[model samples]
Target: VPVPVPVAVSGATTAGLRAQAARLAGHLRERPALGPEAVARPLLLSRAQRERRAVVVAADRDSLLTGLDALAGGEAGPRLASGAADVTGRVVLVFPGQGAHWTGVAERLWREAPVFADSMARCADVLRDLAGWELREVLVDPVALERVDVLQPVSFAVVVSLAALWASVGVRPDAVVGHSQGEVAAAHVAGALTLAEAARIVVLRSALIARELSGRGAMLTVVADVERVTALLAGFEGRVCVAAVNGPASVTVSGEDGAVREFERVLSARRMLRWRLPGVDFAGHSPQVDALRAELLAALGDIASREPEIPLLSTVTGEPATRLDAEHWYRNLREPVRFADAVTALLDRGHRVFVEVSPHPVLTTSVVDLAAPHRTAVVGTLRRDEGGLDRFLLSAAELHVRGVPVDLARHAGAGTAEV
Candidate 1:
């Protein structure tokens, strides 16, 4: 039983060191735990430290964690490197569905992150020609984001820009996957769909949804296992059906209002956590989407599909995509989102890091739950009300701790910063 030596910690100034330590500890101490991204802030902040070392000595686990406060005080117990450490793994990018968008989303990054701003500008140019509206309109008018046509395109642009931000910092993905409409973005990112081609699908498909499907149907998120939901959906048949199997425990049902409400009532009495999604007046990934089949195909018109530079995992088929033609996209809109199966496919392929590339996270929980059985790291780019380059950097840091390589020094540029 040898006593440990208390040596001085090295990184920032004595005062700055104390501040950083407290800030890092605060992030870890947040109620409900901020998230994997926030929890890894310390590693990001300490990336440039000459001496990145510290030691925690306590009699118990709780005491060891609580002792982080002493790190800000006068306690300095630096420890030697045990051995050559290895923190490297394959990373996968995940693009979520419609519900991940918000008004003013990525507004800060539009000003602070050059790569994000430039990438979004490119998306806007293509979307304007197809949609007959400026992509940035949602930033000015909160109500515009409520429109399905507007929301889908805007979410697509933001997701694409967010991926660009990741690439700027050398956090490129080994593979890409998408939930629903997100597949269009994934296709573009993976080099299977041209920007104009993807934009047409997003614009035309969403426009049809607004015209023919909006106000005719509804969507509900039921927090229960798939088997129970599948059994319940059997009674509803075409009236109501599973739209998305988000995770092993999360399923979404979509259909006509009467049928959705009827199903909601059943879940209510059963004491299950259930809530209808907002702004999703149109039901997708169900029988109701069949109406748009002919129209969607006609509008898209045998679009071109190029071979992807990176792999594009199909959530519709729950495996690697062979091609991304118009017919494949039509099936994407009408089929139940097999997100869990797709993630399991990524895990099986040895992708250890899963990042949800959206304005806010709607799929990280599902990714984490499915990848729980394996050694994996799940993170999201930005969070609700916290969309900025700073938050983006935090997420990069989270990946850094989990064996993913990130260029923390690449955060500077001319009249702007590379985020």
Candidate 2:
């Protein structure tokens, strides 16, 4: 067989390479067989770190892998290994919005699970003060379900409780991040705000959206990248803007309904790519959000917060952020959700377990695509058209199978499902 040359970590270290080779062989001579990649990746990392320049050359995959000490850094090899089905990684809690909810989503879970019921009851109590009717009544109301004013706060309440339900079942997160309106619930779940405060924020935030921003704007998903979307928006200018760059091929545009529909016509004229408007009235994460900024600030100023107990990947900053204030919360309304960037940051830091805590999963597929390189376990809490407990347990089962450390008490009681 021909010898493979080094692709990286090559230099005059070739002169000293003989010495390094001798040490590696001797050190590995007595070690039992180890997983090739279970060591190779960390070995590459180790040599790259110790070298003044980060480069590693290995004779073969197995040899370099064998050179790994299988100690502190060993997990990397296995983590990045294909079929990362058994290794544990950091857990991330993801929250999304209106698209994620449906009637009867949490109904069964509320009746069957103590944790789910407790969280709902608690948040409902907080909402009762603002909403007037029992939160549960509004939650199950078919007509009320369609109202953004009613749905947003109810969505927040559901997500918050699902997070609590997961926590009770031992699926605690190492990090948390929210997209758009989900930030309110995310803040409370991560301990950046108290439950009451989060409830208040969601309540006020929704009222502001319904009154100032709700019916005024709309959103569209374009099968194009940011550059193309930005170019298309040049004509509309402030009338519309990119709400989210969902992926290389998926971007959401938002603005006044007529302007958004106008861009739709332009896309149609050019025959550039597919575009569809999500069934939503609020053009969240667009320039139109700026219309609500001052009012949002007025309602949300002095919004209470504290240091997040867990790491929060900011969808606005596309990075980790400190404690959130009123402005930061407001920015979540106007700014495109940097979900793709936020997931990249989390995956880069080895946080590979992602679970969506919404009435039904919306972000799980997106997260899975982004975490593909890391072989992450992306999960959703529930789905529509199925019993919530059955779906929730099934979702938890998949995550647990992927080494997410979830307690299956509910899953077991309900009987297990194949992940």
Candidate 3:
């Protein structure tokens, strides 16, 4: 399969036939081909053509036909809607959790990208005091959340570090929102809580999970929505629950392994797919979290927080939170994530950018689907199962093109991979 080249195909008016050709041309981009009659379709580029920064957009049939006739030399259509330089880009920081982490995540940046390394080091400093392992060494051989004792602290460190790195580059977010564990990091970055305080909560939360809940339960993501997914989990009240409402029709189910298995069995009738989330056995954001209530609250009761310095959107409540406190963190454990709703709310507020600040991408899929109707871009910072600085840099490049301010000099001077 060839990668898509970025190119715009536009307006063609052949009266009656123009609409159909322009429309048909748009559909042709998917099947794949490269033709330059007068009309050039989306060309599946050999690495050769890509060097030219080529873009192919196909739209309406006859419109595409005559339109193609006019663009013989790769000429662009139409003019501009002048004075576009005045608008400021609005971005909402979206943090994610669990499987987003992988071995050596952001570690390369530590040795190569100075800005990222320094930020992670600061976070690592705090984590060193809380967790049993050294943060830097742990990254070299990162464990799954099944070993959440390490997973939580290290992953949290990367999340907060990435947020700081983005800020340093001038891509400051207008608002922040997070999914499950990611919420803790988002709160800290938004200034509702101090770094050390957030660390305590994350460390203790994972510590408790490792000590008390490890291996006792499981979670699986289902390709369905809340209304239907929850109803499907009926009769399994205490045993299982709809854990995260990821998207309009994408959700996660969590609970006892046996119940989860049976839950999927019932879902089999609908022919929808369900898969286990990697690196986790202990279910989160579900009633099953009740067992950890006493200890989790005890561990976090001393948490001191401030009103958010930036808007902190709550996926748990589907509203903007002035502050996220001890009780809010506790409820986050047992409540279903209103992620899709939160995304909708942000879009309503006129936000057009979503950047998932995690070592690996997880929540971008849901954010993208929810933001698509509005034609917004939902970007993931890093790739899952892959490690490096290139992907991260490309994301920064993307933000730059989208009108988000990025200090390219520093990013370009940050040097390359050395992890």
Candidate 4:
């Protein structure tokens, strides 16, 4: 039952804390009687934030005492919660599509974390010039967050910022994948597109959807596989189609409102699990989006794409994204999301960790299903009502114990109080 845990120590600087952690680990190594618990703990030490300045993942009594000595010696003497866990793997950063947004998602982080705030500020500046609304206002306004146009841009900014926060802590992803609109953020993070370019794409695309396709169709999340869902929608043909293959049994159907409603009715009669996306009036990734093709091509056609720094496993093609042109962006809105396939491809490529970068973890369940067989790890940046530095640190801690490199040593002096 003993498993690896992150034992953290805090001090005035990264140099000091790093030295302390190394020494404590050395002590544990020199003393053979310290046992397996000392060897299994992943040491974590950083500056003080919301509570204890240090943490140690303890496996046994001996290890806990030694970890306590390290903390007390480092001047961060305190106790926190503990539990059992076992993990190890490389990491994949995932950007989620719709349904991750909520009112005040960024309000707390905006005021607390500089890295997060700085990233959001850059997004805000670009959006102010392009979308004409302040990012801060739209993030907290319930009414604005409800609109697809506002929701898409806000979600894009938050995900990109979450990526920044992860980078600050040293958890670089081995690969990246995104679901639907999330791909824009993934593209930006992967270096295929600049913040300005990503912002333009999200703003223009959302505006186009609102102006052209809004109120004409709808979307529904159904708990069924593509084969069964395909057969179910066969009768509707052009009226309804699979919008996304989120998992082995999770799919989203999008099409005309009447058709979606009719499909929902059928699911209800069968006592199947299905729910309509409340604010999504447009049927993205369905034929209903084809109407916006020409204008989108014209607006985004000139945007250029560069080679990515990190591998981007695209949901659009279920392959590594190479040509992210205007046409590709158009197809991104017009094509069904191959999320399950893209995730499977990542798993096959040896990626065993997934970090869902969003305000809320809307895609966690689907990712868990796909990664379960692979013994993979999954963590979220922030939750709906729990958006703050404390929540983020817990996710970072989970990643650390799971064998993902958290460069906490590098950012130790950045004032955890300011994080």
Find the candidate with the highest lDDT and give its number.
4
**Residue pairs in candidate 4 whose N, alpha carbon or C atoms collide under 3 angstroms:** 6-57, 7-44, 7-55, 7-56, 7-57, 8-44, 8-55, 8-56, 9-45
Please write out the lDDT profile of model 4 over residues 94-207, one tens digit for every residue.
999887777888888887678999999999999999999999988878888778888899889999999999998887887899899999999999999999999999999998
Better of 1 and 3 by lDDT: 1
The sequence of per-residue lDDT tens digits that candidate 3 reaches over residues 104-189 is: 67777676556778878888888878775678888877444338878888888888888877777677889999888888998898
RMSD of 2: 13.4
Ranking by TM-score: 1, 4, 3, 2
**Selected candidate, larger lDDT, 1 vs 4:** 4
Ranking by lDDT: 4, 1, 3, 2
Worst 10 residues of 1 by lDDT: 77-86
* TM-score of every prediction relative to native: 0.80, 0.74, 0.76, 0.80
Cα displacement (Å) at residue 1, model 1: 52
Regions of model 3 farther than 4 Å from truth: 1-89, 142-145, 413-419
User: Model 1: per-residue lDDT, tens digit, 276-332?
Assistant: 776688888888788788988898888888999998889899989986888999999
* TM-score, cand. 4: 0.80
RMSD to truth, every model: 9.6, 13.4, 10.4, 9.1
Off by over 4 Å in 2: 1-84, 266-279, 409-419
Could you tally the backbone clashes for each prediction?
Answer: 1, 0, 18, 9
Task: Judge candidate 4 at residue 223 and give its lDDT.
Answer: 90
lDDT assessment of candidate 2 = 0.67
lDDT of each: 0.74, 0.67, 0.67, 0.77
For candidate 2, write residues 19-76 as lDDT tens digits. Answer: 4444444445555443222333333333332121111222344534433322113222
